[PDB]
Design a protein around this motif. Structure first.
Motif, PDB file in Angstrom:
ATOM      1  N   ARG A 160      41.471  -3.080 -43.378  1.00 16.09           N
ATOM      2  CA  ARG A 160      41.121  -4.432 -43.572  1.00 16.09           C
ATOM      3  C   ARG A 160      41.724  -5.274 -42.258  1.00 16.09           C
ATOM      4  O   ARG A 160      42.819  -4.917 -41.981  1.00 16.09           O
ATOM      5  CB  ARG A 160      41.015  -5.346 -44.911  1.00 16.09           C
ATOM      6  CG  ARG A 160      40.763  -4.398 -45.976  1.00 16.09           C
ATOM      7  CD  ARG A 160      38.935  -4.497 -46.202  1.00 16.09           C
ATOM      8  NE  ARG A 160      38.573  -3.261 -45.292  1.00 16.09           N
ATOM      9  CZ  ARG A 160      38.536  -2.123 -45.122  1.00 16.09           C
ATOM     10  NH1 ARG A 160      38.980  -1.603 -46.328  1.00 16.09           N
ATOM     11  NH2 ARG A 160      37.848  -1.600 -44.136  1.00 16.09           N
ATOM     12  N   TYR A 161      41.096  -6.193 -41.898  1.00 15.98           N
ATOM     13  CA  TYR A 161      41.544  -7.111 -41.084  1.00 15.98           C
ATOM     14  C   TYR A 161      42.904  -8.013 -41.835  1.00 15.98           C
ATOM     15  O   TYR A 161      42.480  -8.447 -42.908  1.00 15.98           O
ATOM     16  CB  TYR A 161      41.045  -8.367 -40.621  1.00 15.98           C
ATOM     17  CG  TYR A 161      39.845  -7.825 -39.535  1.00 15.98           C
ATOM     18  CD1 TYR A 161      40.154  -7.182 -38.178  1.00 15.98           C
ATOM     19  CD2 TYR A 161      38.519  -8.295 -39.425  1.00 15.98           C
ATOM     20  CE1 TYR A 161      39.333  -6.824 -37.174  1.00 15.98           C
ATOM     21  CE2 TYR A 161      37.634  -7.833 -38.253  1.00 15.98           C
ATOM     22  CZ  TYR A 161      38.161  -7.155 -37.363  1.00 15.98           C
ATOM     23  OH  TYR A 161      37.245  -6.966 -36.397  1.00 15.98           O
ATOM     24  N   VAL A 162      44.059  -8.161 -41.014  1.00 16.22           N
ATOM     25  CA  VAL A 162      45.097  -8.547 -42.058  1.00 16.22           C
ATOM     26  C   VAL A 162      44.839 -10.166 -42.372  1.00 16.22           C
ATOM     27  O   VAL A 162      45.029 -10.577 -43.313  1.00 16.22           O
ATOM     28  CB  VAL A 162      46.552  -8.441 -41.401  1.00 16.22           C
ATOM     29  CG1 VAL A 162      46.612  -9.336 -40.136  1.00 16.22           C
ATOM     30  CG2 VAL A 162      47.516  -8.345 -42.346  1.00 16.22           C
ATOM     31  N   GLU A 163      44.125 -10.610 -41.433  1.00 14.37           N
ATOM     32  CA  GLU A 163      43.721 -12.201 -41.440  1.00 14.37           C
ATOM     33  C   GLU A 163      42.830 -12.410 -42.891  1.00 14.37           C
ATOM     34  O   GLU A 163      42.493 -13.511 -43.221  1.00 14.37           O
ATOM     35  CB  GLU A 163      43.256 -12.848 -40.345  1.00 14.37           C
ATOM     36  CG  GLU A 163      42.152 -12.510 -39.921  1.00 14.37           C
ATOM     37  CD  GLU A 163      41.919 -11.500 -38.850  1.00 14.37           C
ATOM     38  OE1 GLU A 163      42.873 -10.586 -38.683  1.00 14.37           O
ATOM     39  OE2 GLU A 163      40.917 -11.080 -38.221  1.00 14.37           O
ATOM     40  N   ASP A 164      42.058 -11.149 -43.170  1.00 15.62           N
ATOM     41  CA  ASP A 164      41.278 -11.329 -44.572  1.00 15.62           C
ATOM     42  C   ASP A 164      42.102 -10.991 -45.778  1.00 15.62           C
ATOM     43  O   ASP A 164      41.174 -11.253 -46.802  1.00 15.62           O
ATOM     44  CB  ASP A 164      39.939 -10.421 -44.387  1.00 15.62           C
ATOM     45  CG  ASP A 164      38.978 -10.761 -42.954  1.00 15.62           C
ATOM     46  OD1 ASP A 164      39.035 -11.919 -42.749  1.00 15.62           O
ATOM     47  OD2 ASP A 164      38.260  -9.888 -42.761  1.00 15.62           O
TER      48      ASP A 164
ATOM     49  N   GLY B 170      46.448  -5.803 -35.885  1.00 17.32           N
ATOM     50  CA  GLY B 170      46.464  -6.484 -36.853  1.00 17.32           C
ATOM     51  C   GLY B 170      45.614  -5.894 -38.217  1.00 17.32           C
ATOM     52  O   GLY B 170      45.206  -6.747 -39.271  1.00 17.32           O
ATOM     53  N   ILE B 171      45.391  -4.514 -38.120  1.00 15.66           N
ATOM     54  CA  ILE B 171      44.640  -4.090 -39.228  1.00 15.66           C
ATOM     55  C   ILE B 171      45.483  -3.403 -40.083  1.00 15.66           C
ATOM     56  O   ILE B 171      46.696  -2.441 -39.679  1.00 15.66           O
ATOM     57  CB  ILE B 171      43.500  -2.800 -38.623  1.00 15.66           C
ATOM     58  CG1 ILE B 171      42.272  -3.276 -37.916  1.00 15.66           C
ATOM     59  CG2 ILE B 171      43.357  -1.885 -39.540  1.00 15.66           C
ATOM     60  CD1 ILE B 171      42.458  -4.273 -36.852  1.00 15.66           C
TER      61      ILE B 171
END
Ligand code: NFU
Ligand code: SF4
Ligand code: SF4
Ligand code: SF4
Ligand code: FES
Ligand SMILES: [Ca+2]
Ligand SMILES: [Mg+2]
Lengths: 298, 447, 138
Positions: free
Chosen positions: B47-51, B387-388
């Motif tokens: 997942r995208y770390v920002e999510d 950033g994944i």
């Protein structure tokens, strides 16, 4: 009216949204008989002759499956309460991994875990079901209240309709109508795709037009669009409209169509796929189990 | 004879207590089992770390704010960004509002039924509705407290359940002066109701002491909590550990938690059994939240809460090991959080427009930590250069009170049960009352 | 024993015509594909392709007008953007990128259609069956 509630593979958020009726919850409980609700009362078994059942969460283990079938046989009306029950929800992302991989991480390879024996809890605990499944895949569901979680007022309107012998009606449009953001009369045109942290968004202009992946276009209205109003794109937590089976597929279709539409014939079609490093997480956060392809093949 | 209390009611999540006897009729085995797991730690990979602050709140519907902020913090560390002071204040304001809603919810909706009716055989009376029929003012006040808490979360977080403003570098929106002013007017009432709640708790815990139920599940252990220069803090500080006699054993920055905490696994439960890594499973048992936090703190950061805390420490000493006193410490924290909401709203920086910082280069690791209403919450993410997420570890509050619950439920049965005839509805409920004293959130605990 | 199950989506103005030309010319090719007609490749979108895989497709083929030759001017430009995302979405779902094939084949390109069908059949046949439907039925 005798009503009962239960929770399966969810988070309790829908029950908390029901409690967020606040003073109105007491008024609702005056006109209804709550015969089962694990979080509020100590009635251990689901009784017979239940009229309305609010089932929160999707199917994650054999116990949920058992309870869903149990509640279905004792309840006259069954409601898939919330996005997890209705579409699978965030836990559905576990479908991208085998159950053995989920359990091995949580009980063996997490950095703080000390399990030299390599045991996976298997005593007095239910086994996980092959994949997360929406409630409707295992039992007949009469109605559904979408949302992660559904707003308190919507939960009350649905239950109140059943109390009055009326058919509940969910809003039918996508989120842009409710959203207060400004949309161009010329139509949507996307020049570049940005991650939520990239750039500094304009607080008035539509987030999709600005290059952010906003699921509002492929998501049912009803929430009031608090996310774009609060400065962030919609993540699609209310799920799709009644006319869309697979939310992520339709979002991808729409996005791909308007990407570089002003330079339609010359836009490189490889830009968009390279820009999105996590495609499933971008388009199926809340509905992977209800998609045409709901798992990752191993 | 094999008895089983299932499901455990008036707790969040899926739990059960199994009570077994040998062929001679003597009590043999009593265990607390958690029967749910979703696998957030593994499925967050890719997942995208920002999510992460969008996904983690879905670990639990009660404490979604704590998760939103713990993830937001870990994410800020992954992007090497220090957020502006205004963002920290807004984040803490949301956090305190959430704590008011969670502590009010537990004490009144979940715990009070037992404190008000500990000896009744009527289950239709032992709940929110039963309290409301006899004492409607108690529940109306509980609803007001929760409404106030959730209002702060909705205003600062955008949504009362699953907030969305804690983004990379800070907050996605500012608190408008008009919003700050209305929350500030409403803030006095929250402190007032929280203060009235302490008296309710005193009076209700006196009724518990009169039935010899104040010592249920008693055992001694270490205690963990966050402290800012030795002072009670649910948002920022270092994690302090005290031994059973109250002497500080550890004081460390949350990023070093893997060198202090260890998590064991047992075959009969999906909930892990943590302990102080260096002390071991036998000598390293510790507890988290309310009483544990009061035990490690030198003092409360708010004036009103400090008076009740000082009065409490003089009566029960320090560290207090009584599971039933967690209810009282919860009420002290409810008042302290209500007071912090006013304090944060009174700060002029809360309405500032410098709410976000530009993200810096991706640092492959980030640890985010806050004190959730039910204990120390740690979100640890590892990512690639884009950033994944590649790996994650979540040490979620209630998991740390799992040994205490498994021990405590055993101590209750040892005190009240000798033969299966002694396992009456009230005695089985005493075992559930011990579980409820820790305010367990089992969806949270297992994740 | 096993024969691959392939589904095709061909635009009426070009690829469907190209498939007809192969027929008129008696240009033989493997009998795995079953073609579905649409008016434009612009009608094709991920939902239809993903639906084919759910039902049991081992391979999915999409045929449209050459870029710049769309009967409806630019429908294929939209399909082209959709298919590129779809190739990568399939890989994330564990479905080989090669199980999806898109080509631009005109109304008279029967030979190209014939060779495309031969090549796509050999590619799917070599990959073996797609196990999606079996896993979902479990
Ligand atoms: N409070 C709380 Fe959660 Ni529902 C728990 N236990 C999380 O950190
Ligand atoms: S829908 Fe959202 S809120 Fe309701 S359970 Fe699933 S996660 Fe918790
Ligand atoms: S922001 Fe999201 S929801 Fe609001 S209009 Fe643009 S797309 Fe529709
Ligand atoms: S805006 Fe999108 S994500 Fe936010 S609540 Fe409404 S639906 Fe869920
Ligand atoms: S008609 Fe052939 S692609 Fe548009
Ligand atoms: Ca964990
Ligand atoms: Mg993601």
């Amino acid at each position: 009216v005798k009503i009962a509630t239960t929770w399966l593979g969810g988070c309790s958020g829908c029950h908390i949204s029901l409690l967020d009726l606040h003073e109105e919850l007491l008024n609702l409980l005056e006109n209804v008989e709550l015969v089962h609700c694990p979080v509020l009362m100590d009635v251990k078994e689901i009784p017979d002759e239940v009229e309305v059942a609010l089932i929160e969460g999707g199917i994650r283990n054999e116990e949920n499956l058992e309870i869903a079938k149990e509640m279905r046989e004792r309840a006259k009306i069954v409601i898939a309460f919330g996005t997890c029950a209705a579409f699978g929800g965030v836990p559905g992302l576990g479908n991208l991994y085998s159950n053995d991989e989920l359990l091995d991480k949580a009980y063996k390879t997490t950095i703080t875990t000390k399990n030299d024996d390599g045991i996976i809890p298997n005593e007095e605990v239910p086994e996980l079901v092959s994949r997360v499944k929406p409630l409707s895949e295992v039992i007949e569901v009469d109605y559904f209240i979408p949302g992660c979680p559904p707003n308190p007022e919507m939960i009350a309107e649905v239950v109140k309709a059943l109390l009055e012998g009326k058919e509940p009606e969910l809003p039918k449009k996508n989120l842009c109508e409710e959203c207060a953001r400004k949309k161009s009369e010329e139509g949507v045109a996307i020049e570049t795709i940005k991650r939520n942290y990239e750039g500094n968004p304009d607080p008035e202009k539509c987030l999709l037009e600005q290059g952010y992946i906003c699921l509002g276009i492929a998501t049912r209205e009803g929430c009031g669009a608090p996310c774009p109003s609060s400065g962030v794109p919609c993540s699609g937590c209310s799920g799709p409209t009644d006319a869309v089976v697979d939310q992520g597929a339709k979002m991808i279709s729409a996005l791909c169509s308007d990407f570089g539409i002003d330079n339609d014939r010359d836009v490189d079609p490889m830009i968009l796929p390279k820009s999105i490093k996590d495609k499933i997480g971008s388009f199926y956060k809340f509905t992977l189990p209800s998609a045409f392809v709901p798992i990752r093949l191993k | 004879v094999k008895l089983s209390v299932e499901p455990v009611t008036r707790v969040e999540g899926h739990g059960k207590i199994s009570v077994s006897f040998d062929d001679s009729g003597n009590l043999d085995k009593v265990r607390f089992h958690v029967v749910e797991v979703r696998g957030f730690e593994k499925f967050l990979e890719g997942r995208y770390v920002e999510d992460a602050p969008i996904y983690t709140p879905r670990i639990c519907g009660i404490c979604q704010v704590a998760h939103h902020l713990a993830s937001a913090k870990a994410v800020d560390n992954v992007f090497g960004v220090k957020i502006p002071e205004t963002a920290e204040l807004l984040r803490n304001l949301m956090h305190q509002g959430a704590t008011v809603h969670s502590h009010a919810l537990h004490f009144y909706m979940l715990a009070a039924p037992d404190l008000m009716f500990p000896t009744t055989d009527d289950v239709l009376k032992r709940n929110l509705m039963g309290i409301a029929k006899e004492h409607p003012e108690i529940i109306k006040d509980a609803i007001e407290l929760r409404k106030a808490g959730q209002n702060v979360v909705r205003v600062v977080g955008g949504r009362a359940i699953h907030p969305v403003t804690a983004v990379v570098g800070g907050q996605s929106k500012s608190l408008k002066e008009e919003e700050r002013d209305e929350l500030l007017k409403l803030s006095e009432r929250t402190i007032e109701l929280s203060e009235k709640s302490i008296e309710v708790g005193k009076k209700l815990l006196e009724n518990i002491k009169d039935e010899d139920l104040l010592d249920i599940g008693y055992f001694e252990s270490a205690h963990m909590g966050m402290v800012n220069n030795g002072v009670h803090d649910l948002y920022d500080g270092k994690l302090r550990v005290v031994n059973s006699e109250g002497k500080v054993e550890y004081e460390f920055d949350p990023s070093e938690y893997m060198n202090y905490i260890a998590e064991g696994v047992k075959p009969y439960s999906y909930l892990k059994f943590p302990y102080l890594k260096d002390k071991g499973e036998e000598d390293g048992i510790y507890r988290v939240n309310t009483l544990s936090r009061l035990n490690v703190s030198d003092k409360m950061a708010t004036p009103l809460a400090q008076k009740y805390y000082d009065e409490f420490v003089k009566e029960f000493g320090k560290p207090c090991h009584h599971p039933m006193l967690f209810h009282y410490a919860r009420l002290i924290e409810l008042l302290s959080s209500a007071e912090m909401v006013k304090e944060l709203l009174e700060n002029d920086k809360i309405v500032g427009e410098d709410i976000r910082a530009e993200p810096e280069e991706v640092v492959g690791d980030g640890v985010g930590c806050v004190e959730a209403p039910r204990g120390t919450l740690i979100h640890h993410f590892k990512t690639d250069d884009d950033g994944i997420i590649t790996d994650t570890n979540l040490v979620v509050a209630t998991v740390q009170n799992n040994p205490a619950m498994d021990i405590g439920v055993r101590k209750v049965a040892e005190k009240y049960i000798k033969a299966p005839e002694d396992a009456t509805p009230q005695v089985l409920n005493y075992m559930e009352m011990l579980i409820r004293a820790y305010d367990p959130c089992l969806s949270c605990a297992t994740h | 024993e096993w024969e691959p199950k392939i589904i095709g989506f061909c635009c009426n103005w070009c690829t469907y015509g190209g498939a007809d030309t192969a027929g008129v010319g008696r240009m033989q090719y493997p009998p795995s594909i079953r073609i579905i007609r649409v008016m434009c490749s612009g009608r094709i979108e991920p939902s239809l392709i993903l639906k084919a895989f759910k039902e049991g497709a081992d391979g999915v083929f999409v045929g449209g007008c050459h870029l710049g030759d769309c009967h409806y001017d630019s429908g294929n430009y939209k399909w082209q953007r959709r298919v590129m995302m779809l190739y990568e979405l399939l890989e994330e779902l564990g479905i080989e990128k090669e199980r999806l094939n898109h080509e631009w084949i005109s109304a008279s390109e029967g030979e190209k259609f014939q060779n495309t069908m031969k090549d796509f059949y050999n590619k799917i046949e070599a990959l073996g069956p797609c196990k999606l439907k079996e896993e979902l039925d479990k």
